[PDB]
Write a protein that binds this ligand. Structure first.
Ligand SMILES: OC[C@H]1NC[C@H](O)[C@@H](O)[C@@H]1O
Ligand SMILES: [Cl-]
Ligand code: NA
Length: 472
């Protein structure tokens, strides 16, 4: 039993638009902040790589569906490129080519028995909106509502699973470094918090929009994909446990407390630590933006499920480090990695499968066991088809998730592996491979070929169980 998936549980794979599509300026698509970063700042990216072509999924979407069908995916999580649909960011111009493209993909999926799950925003903000300041500027919440309306109107008759945002904890960091994630702005501890605030408002507007204008007719579900690392106490002390709770609240709680709790608002520890630090540094005003009571009420409850991206764990101990000001310094935890944990091709990603189970329990307890869809989980290497590290990563993480479901009563409802295929890995370019299918980026045809992990995941999806040879 502990090795069998629940009958209704949905298994599949995931991608994101900038990472796979290419066709960056084709057929009316407007420029986004990743076009800007990779074109103007190739020095920020391994190999000076760009997403100009990537997997060429704009042209090769039928090949993506073919490999999903081979895999036996029940669900395909993909994102929509805002600037492909609304090239000016604002809703004055709708690019019919973009509408046609995503309709083509959706219809191809459905014709092949695969359910679409759509992420509205996976980091590719139109440059015209970044030019207003991007996410730190609250005007983007209404622009996001208007973008979502176009998506619901055009696609919501066939799409029943939506994610407003992917990893705002990550993309807010594009406002906390001059050389990092797009738009590569250095306002740590100030602009990243403003970005988070706008995102939360935008998410809430989109959810309410769905309720008001679409739900009765379309009958789907709207969630959000939040990333979180497990944070294990470095020692068993109460002090180290406190630091790990700080981590959860400063990483997951930043977004999930306003949305997924009965109380709403930011976590108290977030408000209090930033207020104190801001005062001690001489600011008249806290660096953390505030919600009014009316806003708190509007934002809380804006969810039909919780999307989780899970990859790894850290060790946390009591203390403070990082630059002043910064979210890390504000969070009041000293983070490290255990040298014993297996490595990947990504400095940040160590293999800690039991951390997945711990995180799922933390979520269950904090948010009253919301339905959780694992929207990403995966592993990097530098290349190769005999990807034993990736196979082990998946089988162990899936076993831990199944224990969370069956032993711990966590309401996990689905899982999409990151990623269907090797793709543009942001600042790492094509150097770090996350796919279960390999792609030859030197071959203009971009063939997708199965790795061992694709074969093992197909076996899992077909049999609906963890095969005996991978059991403890
Ligand atoms: O870093 C791996 C993977 N993690 C999370 C992101 O959502 C995805 O875009 C990225 O490729
Ligand atoms: Cl066997
Ligand atoms: Na329209």
């Amino acid at each position: 039993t502990v090795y069998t998936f629940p009958d209704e549980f949905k298994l599949g794979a995931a991608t994101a638009s900038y990472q796979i599509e290419g066709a960056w300026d084709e057929n009316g698509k407007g420029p986004n902040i990743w076009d800007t970063l990779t074109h103007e700042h190739p020095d920020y990216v391994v190999d000076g790589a760009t997403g100009d072509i990537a997997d060429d999924s704009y042209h090769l979407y039928k090949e993506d569906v073919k490999i999903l069908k081979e895999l036996g995916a029940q669900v395909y999580r993909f994102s929509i490129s805002w600037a492909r649909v609304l090239p000016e960011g604002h809703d004055n111009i709708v690019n019919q080519d973009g509408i046609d493209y995503y309709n083509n993909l959706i219809n191809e999926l459905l014709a092949n028995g695969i359910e679409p799950m759509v992420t509205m925003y996976h980091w590719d903000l139109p440059q015209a909106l970044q030019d207003l300041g991007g996410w730190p500027n609250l005007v983007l919440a209404k622009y996001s509502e208007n973008y979502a309306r176009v998506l619901f109107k055009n696609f919501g008759d066939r799409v029943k699973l939506w994610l407003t945002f992917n990893e705002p904890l990550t993309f807010m960091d594009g406002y906390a470094s001059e050389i990092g994630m797009a738009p590569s702005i250095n306002t740590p501890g100030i602009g990243d918090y403003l970005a988070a605030h706008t995102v939360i408002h935008a998410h809430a507007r989109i959810y309410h929009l769905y309720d008001q204008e679409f739900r009765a007719e379309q009958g789907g579900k709207v969630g959000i994909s939040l990333n979180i690392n497990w944070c294990e106490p470095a020692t068993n002390s109460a002090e180290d446990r406190a630091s790990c709770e700080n981590y959860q609240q400063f990483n997951l709680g930043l977004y999930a407390h306003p949305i997924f709790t009965e109380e709403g608002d930011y976590p108290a520890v977030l408000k209090d630590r930033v207020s104190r630090n801001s005062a001690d540094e001489g600011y008249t005003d806290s660096r953390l933006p505030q919600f009014t009571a009316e806003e708190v009420e509007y934002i809380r409850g804006t969810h039909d499920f919780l999307g989780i991206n899970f990859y790894t764990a850290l060790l946390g101990k009591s203390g403070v480090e990082g630059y002043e000001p910064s979210r890390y310094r504000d969070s009041g935890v000293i983070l490290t990695q255990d040298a014993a944990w297996p490595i990947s091709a990504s400095s940040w990603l160590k293999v800690v499968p039991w951390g997945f189970r711990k995180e799922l329990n933390w979520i269950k307890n904090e948010y009253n066991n919301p339905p959780v869809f694992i929207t990403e989980n995966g592993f990097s290497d530098y290349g190769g088809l005999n990807d034993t590290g990736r196979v082990h990563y998946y089988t162990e993480h899936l076993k831990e998730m199944l224990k969370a479901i069956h032993e711990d009563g966590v309401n996990v409802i689905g899982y999409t592996a990151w990623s269907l295929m090797d793709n543009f890995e942001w600042l790492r370019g094509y150097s770090e491979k996350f796919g279960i299918y390999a792609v030859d980026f030197e071959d203009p045809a971009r063939p997708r070929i199965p790795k061992e992990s694709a074969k093992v995941l197909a076996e899992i999806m077909n049999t609906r169980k963890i095969p005996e040879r991978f059991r403890d």
